[PDB]
Amino acid sequence: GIDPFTGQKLDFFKQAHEGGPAPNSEVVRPDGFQSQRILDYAQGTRPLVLNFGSCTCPPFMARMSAFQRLVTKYQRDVDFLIIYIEEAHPSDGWVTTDSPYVIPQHRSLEDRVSAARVLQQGAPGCALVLDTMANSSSSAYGAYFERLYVIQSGTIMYQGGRGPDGYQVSELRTWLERYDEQLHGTRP
């Protein structure tokens, strides 16, 4: 069906939500730009944590070292993935940017991977993909600017709530704490 008022196909896809299906949306491997999808990163029944953001997004950068600490802490039972998306504060935007990072809006995967490289120089050994230039995953996960998720066996277990910045990491840590506790007992 076509929308008379857009001329585009009619959307029938419900927005991502907890307890709903995790979109198997498209992403790009930085080395060689091969097409991949979010669920390619799920390892059997292990939860997969998704971390969307960019270098010019201050809350994303503010939590990176805490995120890396979560990887060390929970990697026994949980997998982690960073998705590098459109810049929050591009250097060539309308409003002037004071971000420590000076990155123009990506015009191609070569630009986006260049930006992601700046990130990867921190975050040694973290799994990282790029969103497609069509912003497939950002759109499917409502994850522009930045967002955190947990998915497990194709289902969204945790959707990072919009609201005061700071809480998203503590709320994710809470989810991971409770899962680890179910698996192994409370840590002393």
Rounded-to-integer distance, Cα 81 and Cα 83, Å:
7
Q: How far apart are CA 188 and CA 176, in angstroms?
A: 16
Distance between the two ends of the chain, CA-based, in angstroms? 58
Distance of CA 96 to the CA centre of its chain: 26
Which pair of structure tokens corresponds to residue 143? Answer: 């994850």
Radius of gyration of the chain (CA): 17
The tokens of 134 are what?
């069509």
Q: Enumerate residues 6+ apart whose C-beta is below 8 A from 58.
A: 88, 99
Residue range of the domain that includes 110 = 1-188
CATH number at residue 87: 3.40.30.10
**Structure-token match 């459109």, residue found:** 86
Secondary structure letter of residue 129 according to DSSP: E
> Would you give the DSSP letter of residue 176?
H
Q: How many domains does the chain have?
A: 1
CA distance 169 to 71: 12
